[PDB]
Amino acid sequence: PKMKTHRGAAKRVKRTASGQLKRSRAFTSHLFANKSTKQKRQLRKARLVSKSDMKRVKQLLAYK
């Protein structure tokens, strides 16, 4: 029947121009007092999924 999606992962990443997947970083959302500044802003970015996890997860995102 119709394929479902990983709703919880819908909420964590965005699709790009070509086909890629634009993700939020992690090690955030709490205490940064134990952290430096370079280490704080360089996490204020967004990265791309690697092809490996992509291989693992491709069937999950049919509808983006």
Partner 1 sequence: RVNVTLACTECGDRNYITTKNKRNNPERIEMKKYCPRLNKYTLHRET
**Residue 32 binding partner per list RNA, partner 1, none, with a CB distance cut-off of 5 to 8 Å that depends on partner kind:** partner 1
Least distance between RNA and beta carbon 9 (Å): 12
CB 46 within 8 A of CB 23: yes
The contact pattern for RNA, residues 15-54, with x = CB under 7 A and - = no contact, is -xxx-x-x--xxxxxxx--x-xxxx-xxxx-xxxxxxxx-
What tokens appear for 46 in the block?
């967004």
Judged by beta carbon, residue 17 or residue 31, the one nearer partner 1 is 31
Judged by beta carbon, residue 7 or residue 30, the one nearer partner 1 is 30
CA R_g for the chain:
15
Alpha-carbon 11 to chain mean position? 9
What tokens appear for 13 in the block?
């990443």
